Amino acid sequence: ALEAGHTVNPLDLEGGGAFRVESLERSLH
Amino acid sequence: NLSFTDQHIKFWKKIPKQKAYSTVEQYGQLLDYGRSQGAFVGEGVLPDTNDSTYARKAAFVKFLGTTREVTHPMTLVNSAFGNVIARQNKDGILWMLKQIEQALFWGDSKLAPGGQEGLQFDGINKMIDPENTIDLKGNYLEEKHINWGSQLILQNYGTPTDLMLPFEVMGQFSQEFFPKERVIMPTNDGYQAGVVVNKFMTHGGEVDFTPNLFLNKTTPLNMNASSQKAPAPGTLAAEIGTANDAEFGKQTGGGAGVYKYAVTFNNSHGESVPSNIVDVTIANEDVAKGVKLTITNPVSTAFPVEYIKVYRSEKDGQRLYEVAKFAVTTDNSGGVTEHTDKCEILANTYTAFMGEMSEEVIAFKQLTPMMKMDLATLGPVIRWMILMYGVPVMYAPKKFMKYTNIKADVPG
Amino acid sequence: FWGDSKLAPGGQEGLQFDGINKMIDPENTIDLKGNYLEEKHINWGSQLILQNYGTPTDLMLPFEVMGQFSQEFFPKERVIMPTNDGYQAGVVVNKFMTHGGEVD
Amino acid sequence: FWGDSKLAPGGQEGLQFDGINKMIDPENTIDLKGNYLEEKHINWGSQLILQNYGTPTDLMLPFEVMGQFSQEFFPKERVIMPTNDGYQAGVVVNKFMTHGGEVDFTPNLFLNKTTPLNMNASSQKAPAPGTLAAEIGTANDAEFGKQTGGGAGVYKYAVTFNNSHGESVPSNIVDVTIANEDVAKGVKLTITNPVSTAFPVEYIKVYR
Amino acid sequence: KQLTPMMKMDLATLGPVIRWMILMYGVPVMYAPKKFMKYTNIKADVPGYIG
């Protein structure tokens, strides 16, 4: 199937992970 | 209804909630404004240059679910207590709520063969920085330790707001104020006794007490498997290790004695029956060296093993309680895993947490809220399931703390 | 209080109905081994009721136990120095405040 | 707090300004000898300021000392027999009253204890490490015996070299054994400058 | 006694780098040295020993 994994490194994405976009919170802690 | 209601869920209704847009969520932190190098320069001289420190972190979303089924004939007969589908939905939601409440405390995401990514998410116990830990070594909680924790929090630019403790520790703590009651001589006819403390004032702020019915002590050993899909039992062998930093000697009266050991095999479905019991004798000079455990996987299990729970009894005791939890090296048949016990957690003790409960410190990110989904008709049976996706995140790990190895004798 | 419905020969059904002493779960029992009832045992019982998702409201006790309960509060009495003519002693406790709620 | 304007070589004028620790007259010093801050020491300091025609108003102390001071008031709490439905516990001492007026307490988060030794240089422009030699001195007014257990024991010594740019690497660690009859004699330290330092050296810090 | 408050001053462009400095000039003055005092050797450890 098409799965969205937990891969962080953009150069290791494969399968459904290649379709994910970056999600970053806009407030600095 | 003889079971718990919705009012017994405390930590789930209080933590803030945020939306999630992926399975990986990222955030940035500011650590330093500059390194200390001196700032005095002199007349007409160019000063040095400083740099700051920043970091980037990520969190991974996990999943939960359960399934309920009702047969076709059951939906046709008359029922005395109303509709059955609504009752099943209510039961499923309450069960899921209890699981969420306890997973927010005792979750662990590193329980997988080889230490890989697991199926759970990290809880409060694992996300707190290891430095902000106070070990009571098996003693009652007093008023000093609250100030100690408040100081630990405030020296990291935090502000204590809440303290979360079990009910037994609450009762034991309130018992310590009994000898401070005083009565005036012209007594009336009837008095109210008993002292209950709800709030505390420290030198770094004010703290509120929040007893929790689902926060407990170390889990005692159970002789029956929690699920028929749990793995098969294995074997256990124990002896004296070769370490030099064990903490067996931190107990009252030393650490020499006779201890009992057992292990249970676990997966994502449940827990297996306990293994064989092993008795280990620790001499007076062996308190510094740990106990080495050798664990062998079952040969013909129907489900794979993922992690192992270690049970230890009290000093010269008979009942066993859970003291350790770690993942297996391999899930192959007859695999061997080794572990050294250093008495980091004492048996039959409690745990409490204090920290700043604000959205700028801790939050929960939801990919989807609790929701229902139907299932295909494989026969004259109605089936459906309930799901939620999400993960908790703590932005400032050192604005929290925890007490470990708390002694309390309220129930007995 | 002291009913029993299994007093027929051979342990069959009798003529009485079961009392409170028989329908209480055997786990919810604290044995004092012939000692006094102290102040912390109230909290112990409150915890035993609480952990089974209940709220304590009442404590039914005989008169003598209530009388013996006042021993612990005797050494806590205090009198202000500008004493009057005659004083009334004795402390009688009719309510308690546990961590699980108020008990009468 | 910790400024010092006489850190130039030879005791000349430096690049810093004196702080509270140096402007205060050396006589106006109370030594607690490694004990807790009781309530009478507040009166001690208040009189030490009053005897110079002044009026004490503020006291600046770290959070740890304030918490330890407030801890001592716990066994003084009392409850009246008619009991409410819940209480609030904890005692925090905001101010104190002496024979010369009332003094406020102002805990400061940047007022810390003695800085522990650091095994790495603070900046790349700091000087080079040197050598240290330690032995029993020949003075007759050492204060090693003011501790509760006495001055007998074993102590460790190390030094670092400093300039206006940062702190150097710790020197070698030397162990000195002090007997019960040598507590009145100090410790004589011999500090040697680096052979081939790349940046100048201005002052020294002693670590015990 | 503050000669100038905290201020920002730009530096010359010696390359593709933007630079600036932050300066402040002053000194504290204590007219009455003996109207102050200090406690030394205070012992206090809030996260103390359990034993």
Automatic annotation (TrEMBL), chain C:
It comes from the Viruses. This is Gp6.1. It comes from Bacillus phage SP01 (Bacteriophage SP01). The gene is 6.1. The chain holds residues 157 to 260 of 468 of the full protein.
